[PDB]
Amino acid sequence: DVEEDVKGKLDEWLNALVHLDKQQVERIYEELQGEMKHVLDFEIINYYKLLYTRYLIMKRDISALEEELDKLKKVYKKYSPFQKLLYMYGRGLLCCLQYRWKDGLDYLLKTEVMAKEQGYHETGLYYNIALAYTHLDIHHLAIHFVNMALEGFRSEAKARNIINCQILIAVSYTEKGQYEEALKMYESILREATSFADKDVLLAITLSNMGSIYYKKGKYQQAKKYYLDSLQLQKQIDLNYLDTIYEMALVCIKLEELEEARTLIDKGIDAAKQEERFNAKLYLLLMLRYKYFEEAKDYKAFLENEAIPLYKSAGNKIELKKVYVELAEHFSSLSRFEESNRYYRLVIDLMN
Amino acid sequence: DLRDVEEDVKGKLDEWLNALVHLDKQQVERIYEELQGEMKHVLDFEIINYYKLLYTRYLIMKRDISALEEELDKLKKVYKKYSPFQKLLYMYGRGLLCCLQYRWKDGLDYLLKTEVMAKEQGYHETGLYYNIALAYTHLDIHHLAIHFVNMALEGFRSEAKARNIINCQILIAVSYTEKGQYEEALKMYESILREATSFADKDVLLAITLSNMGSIYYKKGKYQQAKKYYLDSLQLQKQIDLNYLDTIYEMALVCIKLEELEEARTLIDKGIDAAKQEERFNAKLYLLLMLRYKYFEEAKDYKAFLENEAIPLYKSAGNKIELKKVYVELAEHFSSLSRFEESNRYYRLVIDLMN
């Protein structure tokens, strides 16, 4: 009977896990570990076990999540409709963390239809669904859920999530649509003045995209300022950082600033050798240096003997296509259209 | 009085809806002719337009594209002020319109918005999921195609509609075929060979399966098997339609690989005359005509037909899939005539269509 407070304590831990109050999550997680050893009601135990999976995604532990999620898998039959709900939710987030967006979406969609049946709501769910749809390129459905997520997030007055939705919205309308509508969304982010944790991380991304938008619009001077501001906001060395440098180095070329361009390129290269995680990005910067600061004779040489054989290792995306097009454009520029056709045909075979 | 006249019409309109959703052709035609004698009595703006949107679905079922536009272009400006369900009917009809016109990318765009409106109104249609996946198939986006058939599949399962369930299985095996997994697709088609016998239209199910199987044996290299599966498919094709033109076009290619040109030459002429009759087959008519010129007409005449008739036709209608095919043939042609610069030109054009 005394474990009915733990039942309520498990519900309190649920609130801290939904609104992501990490300071409250940790104190309850510790308090429970001592009290969870005594209680032996499996509708109360499996409650904690599933909330732990929710705790694991907050602690970004994929491996431990996979372990536990596979354990609860067999016990799924005898769960409560709400406990059944949490399992489907956890696997969705797992696949999202494993970037299996199609598999995650299936789980997250079931997570929605269960929540509706038993009359349960969580604003984070809509966001994840929207993030799922977005990362696998379904625009209309992504926008649908990200609005409902945004509506709920405004009612909860959490500015961090507000921007996250606004970023997604602006990104989607940028992928296929007018930039003037996407720029105002980014502009709305900058005007926003509620200071929170890692707001500067979001602004770094916001500025990075605006730099890209204005780069496509031809407005190079403005784009460079946005790239510059982004870089100085960036505190990491992640993939998003190497992108902005590569993009900014392009702007310097457009603005007849080959010195600043090469400097940025060299820094990108030096920062890319650091890890094998972005080994692909490394050669993108090399190609850029051969293209503008080396002989075209050597640029072709690097593309044929270094670039192409590198992307034998899962360069299947734009990277390998990029190398083929550049070579194709190279020969057709020298009016040597035969070799140009050869590489052009390879581009078609790749985009099968 | 006039008031109860409409009350019964609304009921009869809702009945016409379910017949148009569950595809009851004999029931659709029945209510359709009945409504025409009743719809001239009702004058309610809400009810009249409700009928007009439903009438579009009739035109889709009757596959009357030329009349399908006129009804939609008549509503393209004012539909925004209708009831929210009338919008969904408009977006849906417009979506399938693009599909019937082989503008799948545009069709998908409308269908996806239709699904968004579906969730907004608390009303979904399992048939919609299928069409979305069908559009996703022609766009070669198979991972999303598979995503939507599974929703349609489980939808069709709960609705106990075993016939449409098979349609999903066929579509699944199609994506697997394009995904390179030929063996798992064949074994999937064999399972349909047993399932087919349970339905009335079994002969049209076999013709499709035997066709798609023959296509797999064609991609493997087993051409002698390819013809046998195609021949059995054609022998069941007693109805001249889209599927007929697919089988007879694909078989012609098989007779080319088997160096049986005379039979291939015969098949094309039969397929050409078939497509000339109904103008819904213009896409495949000029596709069949390209085969006629590629092998049995001189190269210059083949080139002339591509530049002056093929491209203009596939440019008028946004049938980019076929326009891609024409560009490659022109690119490969000039490449043989050592006119690489003009060949190179078309290679740049075909890449733009893939982005």
XYZ file of C-alpha atoms in Angstrom:
707
model
C 0.000 0.000 0.000
C 2.865 2.348 0.843
C 4.073 2.000 -2.750
C 1.107 4.026 -3.986
C 3.185 7.143 -3.375
C 5.814 5.591 -5.652
C 2.988 5.209 -8.167
C 2.429 8.946 -7.798
C 6.188 9.451 -7.684
C 6.426 7.612 -11.003
C 3.800 10.003 -12.351
C 5.877 12.912 -11.049
C 8.912 11.464 -12.820
C 6.814 11.318 -15.982
C 6.148 15.065 -15.862
C 9.846 15.790 -15.412
C 10.635 13.564 -18.398
C 8.031 15.197 -20.647
C 8.972 18.807 -19.890
C 12.629 17.724 -19.685
C 13.351 19.216 -16.256
C 16.711 17.428 -16.024
C 17.378 18.665 -12.489
C 14.125 17.072 -11.322
C 14.647 13.936 -13.414
C 17.940 13.130 -11.709
C 16.748 13.637 -8.137
C 13.720 11.385 -8.664
C 15.749 8.776 -10.551
C 18.059 8.482 -7.547
C 15.209 8.534 -5.023
C 13.425 5.787 -6.953
C 16.401 3.415 -7.276
C 16.263 2.876 -3.520
C 12.475 2.639 -3.349
C 12.152 0.572 -6.536
C 14.010 -2.336 -4.942
C 11.277 -2.794 -2.334
C 8.137 -2.510 -4.477
C 7.223 -5.692 -6.356
C 4.066 -4.852 -8.296
C 4.811 -5.382 -11.977
C 2.278 -2.808 -13.175
C 4.309 -0.412 -11.042
C 7.669 -1.973 -11.923
C 7.130 -2.024 -15.691
C 6.043 1.582 -15.244
C 9.518 2.482 -13.961
C 11.176 0.247 -16.553
C 9.526 2.142 -19.413
C 10.168 5.556 -17.874
C 13.811 4.492 -17.639
C 13.827 4.122 -21.423
C 12.511 7.677 -21.592
C 15.329 8.613 -19.215
C 17.871 6.897 -21.477
C 16.952 8.944 -24.548
C 17.546 12.049 -22.452
C 20.941 10.620 -21.540
C 21.407 9.987 -25.294
C 22.436 6.370 -24.579
C 21.559 4.416 -27.731
C 23.271 1.156 -26.762
C 21.673 0.953 -23.311
C 18.340 1.921 -24.860
C 18.561 -0.914 -27.390
C 19.361 -3.320 -24.551
C 16.382 -2.391 -22.370
C 13.970 -1.897 -25.277
C 14.707 -5.451 -26.392
C 14.060 -6.735 -22.863
C 10.626 -5.103 -22.594
C 9.840 -6.374 -26.094
C 8.717 -9.815 -24.933
C 6.748 -8.497 -21.954
C 4.754 -6.148 -24.212
C 1.708 -8.441 -24.288
C 0.834 -7.954 -20.614
C 1.258 -4.165 -20.497
C -1.300 -1.469 -19.717
C -2.579 0.532 -22.734
C -0.488 3.428 -21.418
C 2.516 1.179 -20.810
C 2.035 -0.240 -24.313
C 2.077 3.367 -25.493
C 5.457 4.097 -23.922
C 7.121 1.124 -25.615
C 6.027 2.240 -29.084
C 7.192 5.746 -28.208
C 10.600 4.559 -27.013
C 11.318 2.521 -30.129
C 10.332 5.445 -32.332
C 12.781 7.726 -30.548
C 15.384 4.958 -30.738
C 15.016 4.713 -34.512
C 15.092 8.508 -34.663
C 18.317 8.392 -32.663
C 19.537 5.695 -35.056
C 18.319 7.866 -37.951
C 15.958 5.111 -39.092
C 13.309 7.736 -39.800
C 10.937 5.420 -41.670
C 10.962 2.811 -38.912
C 10.674 5.505 -36.248
C 7.721 7.137 -37.985
C 5.768 3.865 -37.911
C 6.266 3.638 -34.153
C 5.549 7.330 -33.585
C 2.340 7.164 -35.614
C 1.079 4.240 -33.545
C 2.114 6.284 -30.523
C -0.318 8.973 -31.705
C -3.284 6.687 -32.370
C -2.913 5.132 -28.918
C -2.673 8.512 -27.208
C -5.907 9.586 -28.893
C -7.790 6.451 -27.818
C -7.039 6.772 -24.102
C -7.190 10.567 -24.287
C -3.526 11.323 -23.652
C -1.492 14.235 -24.996
C 2.192 15.145 -25.149
C 3.364 18.135 -27.192
C 6.785 16.563 -27.699
C 5.173 13.699 -29.622
C 3.875 15.960 -32.380
C 7.329 17.522 -32.711
C 9.077 14.153 -33.071
C 6.517 13.095 -35.682
C 7.126 16.386 -37.495
C 10.890 15.905 -37.166
C 10.441 12.373 -38.509
C 8.465 13.443 -41.570
C 10.921 16.288 -42.174
C 14.122 14.219 -42.067
C 12.585 11.869 -44.691
C 11.291 14.699 -46.923
C 7.471 14.696 -46.579
C 6.734 18.436 -46.505
C 2.954 18.679 -46.123
C 2.662 16.188 -43.273
C 5.695 17.610 -41.463
C 4.233 21.113 -41.526
C 0.931 19.742 -40.246
C 2.369 18.242 -37.068
C 4.968 20.959 -36.466
C 2.145 23.506 -36.280
C 0.248 21.513 -33.662
C 3.547 21.122 -31.837
C 4.162 24.857 -32.085
C 0.639 25.648 -30.882
C 1.108 23.504 -27.789
C 4.623 24.809 -27.174
C 3.354 28.396 -27.066
C 0.769 27.379 -24.476
C 3.574 25.825 -22.426
C 5.625 29.003 -22.907
C 8.878 27.137 -23.571
C 10.879 29.370 -25.918
C 13.516 26.721 -26.692
C 10.984 24.461 -28.395
C 9.301 27.435 -30.085
C 12.453 28.198 -32.045
C 13.013 24.507 -32.809
C 9.634 24.409 -34.524
C 10.254 27.732 -36.267
C 13.598 26.475 -37.557
C 11.969 23.367 -39.029
C 9.236 25.472 -40.628
C 11.754 27.841 -42.200
C 13.903 24.945 -43.408
C 10.985 23.192 -45.123
C 9.859 26.290 -47.029
C 13.489 26.772 -48.056
C 13.910 23.254 -49.461
C 11.074 23.900 -51.904
C 9.426 27.309 -51.757
C 9.938 31.054 -51.483
C 12.759 32.263 -49.245
C 10.994 35.512 -48.360
C 8.584 33.499 -46.221
C 11.442 31.485 -44.726
C 13.587 34.562 -44.059
C 10.913 36.204 -41.918
C 10.763 33.028 -39.845
C 14.516 33.249 -39.295
C 14.127 36.983 -38.698
C 11.492 36.203 -36.063
C 14.034 34.022 -34.279
C 16.610 36.805 -34.035
C 14.089 39.343 -32.731
C 13.190 36.830 -30.011
C 14.805 37.828 -26.712
C 14.324 35.129 -24.069
C 17.695 33.921 -22.813
C 17.989 30.191 -22.183
C 20.521 27.359 -22.265
C 22.228 26.860 -25.639
C 20.207 29.588 -27.345
C 23.463 30.549 -29.050
C 23.558 27.073 -30.589
C 20.195 27.697 -32.251
C 21.171 31.189 -33.409
C 24.321 29.749 -34.968
C 22.117 27.481 -37.086
C 19.650 30.292 -37.804
C 22.431 32.520 -39.144
C 23.984 29.630 -41.073
C 20.773 29.096 -43.032
C 20.258 32.799 -43.707
C 23.765 32.841 -45.134
C 22.705 30.035 -47.458
C 19.441 31.716 -48.437
C 21.137 34.986 -49.395
C 23.865 33.038 -51.186
C 21.225 31.515 -53.444
C 19.636 34.944 -53.907
C 22.963 36.265 -55.196
C 23.217 38.717 -52.303
C 26.765 37.752 -51.350
C 27.746 40.611 -49.037
C 24.841 39.977 -46.677
C 25.369 36.216 -46.816
C 28.989 36.581 -45.699
C 28.020 38.556 -42.593
C 25.556 35.810 -41.623
C 28.157 33.102 -42.168
C 30.669 35.139 -40.159
C 28.285 35.679 -37.241
C 27.429 31.974 -37.337
C 31.070 30.863 -37.104
C 31.755 33.054 -34.066
C 28.606 31.690 -32.416
C 29.679 28.083 -33.116
C 31.409 26.492 -30.109
C 31.870 23.035 -31.615
C 33.566 21.285 -34.536
C 30.547 19.295 -35.754
C 29.317 18.772 -39.326
C 27.355 22.035 -39.276
C 30.582 23.930 -38.623
C 32.511 22.502 -41.572
C 29.504 23.304 -43.769
C 29.397 27.003 -42.892
C 33.144 27.372 -43.506
C 32.830 25.658 -46.892
C 29.831 27.842 -47.726
C 31.597 30.992 -46.508
C 34.730 30.181 -48.503
C 32.485 30.139 -51.578
C 31.184 33.618 -50.799
C 34.741 34.962 -50.600
C 35.404 33.628 -54.094
C 32.232 35.355 -55.302
C 33.384 38.595 -53.674
C 36.818 38.412 -55.315
C 38.521 37.570 -52.020
C 40.700 34.568 -52.858
C 42.989 35.200 -49.895
C 40.234 34.984 -47.288
C 38.752 32.070 -49.236
C 41.939 29.997 -49.087
C 42.395 30.804 -45.403
C 38.903 29.518 -44.598
C 39.509 26.451 -46.753
C 42.809 25.686 -45.030
C 41.169 25.953 -41.613
C 38.339 23.684 -42.702
C 40.896 21.172 -43.962
C 42.970 21.365 -40.780
C 39.820 20.917 -38.683
C 38.585 18.040 -40.846
C 41.736 15.927 -40.464
C 40.934 15.879 -36.749
C 38.438 13.019 -37.022
C 37.357 10.335 -39.490
C 33.709 11.204 -38.787
C 33.834 14.010 -41.348
C 36.411 12.460 -43.669
C 33.974 13.101 -46.516
C 33.849 16.838 -45.788
C 37.662 16.842 -45.838
C 37.885 16.099 -49.551
C 35.127 18.574 -50.376
C 37.454 21.321 -49.142
C 40.436 19.864 -50.988
C 38.491 19.841 -54.249
C 37.651 23.472 -53.592
C 41.336 24.325 -53.195
C 42.408 22.482 -56.353
C 39.576 24.140 -58.259
C 40.539 27.730 -57.456
C 44.135 27.690 -56.187
C 45.694 24.949 -58.312
C 46.128 24.153 -62.000
C 43.062 22.663 -63.686
C 45.465 19.968 -64.880
C 46.051 19.016 -61.239
C 42.418 19.577 -60.244
C 41.420 16.899 -62.739
C 44.211 14.689 -61.409
C 42.999 14.976 -57.821
C 39.430 14.293 -58.926
C 40.308 11.152 -60.882
C 43.044 9.609 -58.745
C 42.043 10.755 -55.247
C 38.420 11.927 -55.097
C 36.602 9.185 -57.033
C 38.411 6.260 -55.387
C 37.664 7.727 -51.946
C 33.908 7.798 -52.525
C 33.973 4.066 -53.214
C 33.179 3.942 -49.503
C 29.520 5.009 -49.359
C 29.969 8.303 -51.194
C 26.779 7.358 -53.039
C 25.120 10.696 -52.297
C 25.812 14.102 -53.840
C 29.533 13.751 -53.040
C 30.295 11.186 -55.748
C 27.822 12.861 -58.104
C 29.616 16.155 -57.439
C 32.987 14.719 -58.479
C 31.483 13.331 -61.686
C 29.757 16.584 -62.653
C 32.886 18.651 -61.957
C 34.926 16.382 -64.229
C 32.142 16.512 -66.813
C 32.111 20.315 -66.671
C 35.904 20.289 -66.824
C 36.160 18.478 -70.149
C 33.218 20.287 -71.740
C 34.935 23.551 -70.807
C 38.015 22.484 -72.762
C 35.624 21.504 -75.577
C 36.650 17.868 -75.031
C 33.046 16.650 -75.014
C 33.790 12.929 -75.397
C 35.305 12.471 -71.933
C 32.628 14.879 -70.739
C 29.891 12.558 -72.014
C 31.560 9.607 -70.306
C 31.389 11.229 -66.876
C 27.931 12.641 -67.621
C 26.605 9.132 -68.252
C 28.067 8.024 -64.924
C 25.979 10.691 -63.187
C 22.797 9.201 -64.635
C 23.706 5.648 -63.614
C 24.359 6.872 -60.074
C 20.960 8.563 -59.741
C 19.087 5.378 -60.669
C -42.295 20.322 -50.421
C -38.872 21.572 -51.553
C -37.369 21.154 -48.082
C -37.819 17.377 -47.880
C -36.718 17.043 -51.505
C -33.243 18.184 -50.474
C -33.182 16.158 -47.251
C -33.523 12.978 -49.311
C -30.993 14.220 -51.872
C -28.399 14.779 -49.139
C -29.028 11.219 -47.995
C -28.719 9.970 -51.566
C -25.571 12.077 -52.011
C -23.989 10.459 -48.953
C -24.870 7.064 -50.424
C -23.235 8.053 -53.707
C -20.118 8.925 -51.717
C -19.627 5.490 -50.170
C -20.216 3.901 -53.568
C -17.481 6.153 -54.973
C -15.159 5.276 -52.089
C -15.788 1.522 -52.107
C -15.810 1.601 -55.926
C -19.224 -0.001 -56.461
C -19.525 0.751 -60.193
C -23.040 -0.652 -60.649
C -24.207 1.289 -57.589
C -22.416 4.487 -58.610
C -24.042 4.518 -62.046
C -27.382 3.757 -60.405
C -27.332 6.679 -57.978
C -25.796 8.898 -60.665
C -28.694 8.597 -63.106
C -31.155 8.877 -60.222
C -29.582 12.113 -58.994
C -29.802 13.846 -62.373
C -33.588 13.692 -62.161
C -33.498 14.963 -58.586
C -30.606 17.442 -58.625
C -32.591 19.833 -60.819
C -35.103 20.206 -57.987
C -32.647 21.122 -55.238
C -31.146 24.618 -55.303
C -29.229 24.756 -52.003
C -25.745 26.159 -52.578
C -24.245 23.709 -50.083
C -25.997 20.655 -51.527
C -25.466 21.559 -55.195
C -21.718 21.929 -54.752
C -21.481 18.802 -52.597
C -22.868 16.993 -55.637
C -20.500 18.738 -58.046
C -17.450 17.577 -56.099
C -18.806 14.024 -55.935
C -19.430 14.181 -59.689
C -15.685 14.629 -60.183
C -15.073 11.267 -58.510
C -17.536 9.785 -60.987
C -15.477 11.226 -63.844
C -12.360 9.734 -62.263
C -14.050 6.341 -62.053
C -15.340 6.757 -65.610
C -11.760 7.804 -66.410
C -12.973 10.858 -68.347
C -9.994 13.215 -68.072
C -11.154 15.851 -70.572
C -14.344 16.445 -68.581
C -12.571 16.102 -65.234
C -10.621 19.323 -65.797
C -13.617 21.411 -66.830
C -15.369 20.667 -63.539
C -12.235 21.367 -61.508
C -11.189 24.484 -63.443
C -14.731 25.689 -62.819
C -14.135 25.414 -59.075
C -10.464 26.423 -58.971
C -11.216 29.949 -57.754
C -14.283 29.650 -55.546
C -13.654 26.321 -53.780
C -11.850 28.138 -50.959
C -15.186 29.421 -49.647
C -16.922 26.028 -49.603
C -17.322 23.585 -46.725
C -13.975 22.078 -45.574
C -14.999 18.635 -46.857
C -15.652 20.033 -50.338
C -12.053 21.245 -50.357
C -10.778 17.745 -49.599
C -12.890 16.431 -52.470
C -11.431 19.130 -54.703
C -7.834 18.443 -53.707
C -8.387 14.692 -54.064
C -9.979 14.987 -57.500
C -7.250 17.381 -58.579
C -4.672 14.938 -57.233
C -6.006 11.979 -59.202
C -6.367 14.269 -62.211
C -2.608 14.776 -62.326
C -2.142 11.034 -61.870
C -4.388 10.264 -64.838
C -2.350 12.844 -66.754
C 0.843 11.148 -65.555
C 1.931 14.262 -63.661
C 2.773 12.265 -60.542
C 4.936 14.858 -58.782
C 2.070 17.343 -58.981
C -0.428 14.602 -58.173
C 1.511 13.620 -55.074
C 1.599 17.267 -54.009
C -2.204 17.478 -54.062
C -2.699 14.021 -52.548
C -0.437 14.847 -49.602
C -2.406 18.027 -48.910
C -5.584 15.948 -49.198
C -4.225 13.671 -46.472
C -3.433 16.726 -44.356
C -7.026 17.911 -44.723
C -8.084 14.357 -43.929
C -6.443 14.517 -40.499
C -7.776 18.045 -39.936
C -11.383 16.963 -40.485
C -11.242 13.680 -38.583
C -12.023 11.798 -41.782
C -9.623 9.519 -43.641
C -9.954 7.250 -46.669
C -7.900 4.067 -47.042
C -7.990 4.428 -50.824
C -6.079 7.701 -50.497
C -3.084 5.988 -48.874
C -2.929 3.645 -51.863
C -2.904 6.453 -54.424
C -0.185 8.275 -52.492
C 1.943 5.131 -52.612
C 1.012 4.645 -56.259
C 2.262 8.147 -57.048
C 5.342 7.489 -54.917
C 6.011 4.449 -57.102
C 6.208 6.274 -60.429
C 8.471 8.834 -58.773
C 10.767 5.929 -57.847
C 10.496 6.852 -54.166
C 10.013 3.292 -52.991
C 10.839 3.616 -49.291
C 7.955 6.065 -48.943
C 5.858 4.002 -51.350
C 6.263 1.011 -49.052
C 5.411 3.241 -46.084
C 2.007 4.168 -47.497
C 0.900 0.772 -48.826
C 1.424 -0.649 -45.334
C -1.024 1.908 -44.000
C -3.370 1.122 -46.879
C -2.804 -2.598 -46.342
C -3.749 -2.514 -42.661
C -6.597 -0.212 -43.634
C -7.858 -2.642 -46.262
C -7.439 -5.517 -43.815
C -9.684 -3.931 -41.186
C -12.209 -3.095 -43.911
C -12.168 -6.765 -45.010
C -11.533 -5.733 -48.618
C -9.387 -8.647 -49.778
C -9.367 -7.478 -53.403
C -7.569 -4.199 -52.716
C -5.217 -6.031 -50.355
C -3.847 -7.876 -53.390
C -3.333 -4.544 -55.173
C -1.026 -3.509 -52.338
C 0.936 -6.766 -52.551
C 1.460 -6.153 -56.275
C 2.707 -2.635 -55.609
C 5.064 -3.909 -52.903
C 6.594 -6.431 -55.291
C 7.004 -3.617 -57.823
C 9.161 -1.504 -55.509
C 11.232 -4.583 -54.651
C 11.793 -5.140 -58.373
C 13.147 -1.612 -58.796
C 15.135 -2.015 -55.573
C 17.127 -4.781 -57.261
C 15.751 -7.583 -55.095
C 14.363 -9.587 -58.014
C 14.149 -12.926 -56.221
C 11.987 -11.749 -53.315
C 9.709 -9.974 -55.800
C 9.171 -13.087 -57.928
C 8.264 -15.190 -54.891
C 5.852 -12.415 -53.952
C 4.217 -12.589 -57.381
C 3.908 -16.379 -57.211
C 1.848 -16.000 -54.044
C -0.530 -13.780 -56.017
C -0.945 -16.500 -58.655
C -2.777 -18.540 -56.022
C -4.636 -15.562 -54.560
C -5.920 -14.502 -57.979
C -8.246 -17.480 -58.437
C -10.430 -16.350 -55.526
C -11.577 -13.183 -57.313
C -13.977 -12.665 -60.217
C -11.496 -10.531 -62.163
C -8.829 -13.219 -61.810
C -7.865 -12.998 -65.485
C -6.878 -9.349 -65.146
C -4.878 -10.155 -62.008
C -2.918 -12.918 -63.714
C -2.225 -10.771 -66.776
C -0.623 -8.144 -64.534
C 1.376 -10.619 -62.439
C 2.581 -12.596 -65.463
C 3.619 -9.295 -67.034
C 5.587 -8.044 -64.040
C 7.211 -11.458 -63.624
C 8.263 -11.428 -67.267
C 9.790 -8.015 -66.641
C 11.933 -9.504 -63.874
C 13.143 -12.312 -66.137
C 13.884 -9.586 -68.679
C 16.143 -7.694 -66.275
C 17.913 -10.901 -65.253
C 18.653 -11.867 -68.845
C 16.314 -14.843 -69.145
C 14.654 -13.555 -72.315
C 13.161 -16.886 -73.385
C 11.368 -16.997 -70.044
C 10.456 -13.329 -70.407
C 8.485 -13.999 -73.591
C 6.662 -17.036 -72.170
C 5.405 -15.035 -69.182
C 4.512 -12.127 -71.473
C 2.767 -14.349 -74.014
C 0.608 -15.926 -71.323
C -0.080 -12.401 -70.089
C -1.176 -11.181 -73.525
C -3.408 -14.200 -74.119
C -5.429 -13.085 -71.098
C -5.479 -9.479 -72.305
C -8.832 -9.500 -74.112
C -9.349 -5.878 -73.066
C -7.466 -3.047 -74.766
C -6.238 -0.699 -72.026
C -3.187 0.680 -70.207
C -1.953 -2.666 -68.898
C -2.321 -4.142 -72.383
C -0.070 -1.441 -73.830
C 2.524 -2.105 -71.134
C 2.703 -5.849 -71.781
C 2.830 -5.509 -75.570
C 5.475 -2.779 -75.404
C 7.686 -4.780 -73.060
C 7.274 -7.959 -75.110
C 8.419 -6.123 -78.240
C 11.740 -5.505 -76.489
C 11.994 -9.205 -75.675
C 11.578 -10.139 -79.338
C 14.380 -7.692 -80.113
C 16.813 -9.398 -77.738
C 15.782 -12.760 -79.195
C 16.509 -11.267 -82.637
C 12.907 -12.030 -83.611
C 12.428 -8.608 -85.179
C 9.535 -9.590 -87.448
C 7.403 -10.587 -84.480
C 8.618 -7.480 -82.667
C 7.735 -5.468 -85.759
C 4.272 -7.040 -85.713
C 3.693 -6.383 -82.010
C 4.555 -2.693 -82.271
C 2.148 -2.131 -85.169
C -0.567 -3.834 -83.105
C 0.268 -1.696 -80.079
C 0.376 1.470 -82.158
C -3.094 0.916 -83.638
C -4.338 0.110 -80.137
C -3.051 3.363 -78.658
C -4.229 5.522 -81.562
C -7.870 4.780 -80.792
C -8.245 6.197 -77.281
C -6.374 9.470 -76.755
C -5.720 8.545 -73.124
C -2.897 6.445 -74.563
C -0.921 9.308 -76.132
C 1.925 8.782 -73.666
C 2.391 5.168 -74.752
C 1.504 5.800 -78.391
C 4.565 7.977 -78.969
C 6.479 5.619 -76.702
C 5.546 2.744 -79.002
C 6.244 4.954 -82.018
C 9.780 5.525 -80.758
C 10.410 1.785 -81.007
C 9.097 1.821 -84.578
C 11.599 4.511 -85.544
C 14.522 3.244 -83.461
C 14.776 -0.104 -85.241
C 12.686 -0.049 -88.413
C 13.208 3.530 -89.608
C 16.446 5.270 -90.601
C 18.394 7.045 -87.860
C 17.701 10.507 -89.283
C 13.958 9.851 -89.332
C 14.286 8.526 -85.785
C 16.076 11.723 -84.775
C 13.481 13.841 -86.571
C 10.647 12.122 -84.714
C 12.356 12.668 -81.363
C 13.102 16.371 -81.797
C 9.957 17.506 -83.590
C 7.217 15.254 -82.196
C 8.404 13.428 -79.069
C 9.812 16.372 -77.097
C 6.977 18.780 -78.037
C 4.380 16.246 -76.867
C 6.169 15.487 -73.597
C 6.776 19.192 -73.028
C 3.135 20.173 -73.479
C 2.167 17.769 -70.694
C 4.591 17.563 -67.772
C 5.273 13.875 -68.434
C 8.913 14.188 -67.379
C 9.500 10.437 -66.977
C 8.951 10.010 -70.716
C 10.826 13.243 -71.501
C 13.828 11.766 -69.667
C 13.614 8.662 -71.857
C 13.595 10.783 -75.030
C 16.588 12.872 -73.948
C 18.678 9.746 -73.320
C 17.806 8.317 -76.737
C 18.817 11.604 -78.363
C 21.973 11.709 -76.249
C 22.914 8.150 -77.230
C 22.093 8.852 -80.873
C 24.430 11.828 -81.315
C 27.044 9.924 -79.319
C 27.002 7.319 -82.089
C 27.176 10.021 -84.763
C 30.205 11.466 -82.939
C 28.325 14.740 -82.446
C 29.305 14.713 -78.780
C 28.696 18.410 -78.121
C 25.051 18.066 -79.139
C 25.015 14.761 -77.269
C 26.505 16.470 -74.214
C 23.724 19.045 -74.454
C 20.966 16.500 -73.853
C 22.887 14.908 -70.987
C 22.729 18.254 -69.192
C 18.984 18.411 -69.843
C 18.252 14.956 -68.445
C 20.128 15.709 -65.221
C 18.029 18.823 -64.580
C 14.866 16.703 -64.721
C 16.232 14.482 -61.947
C 16.515 17.568 -59.724
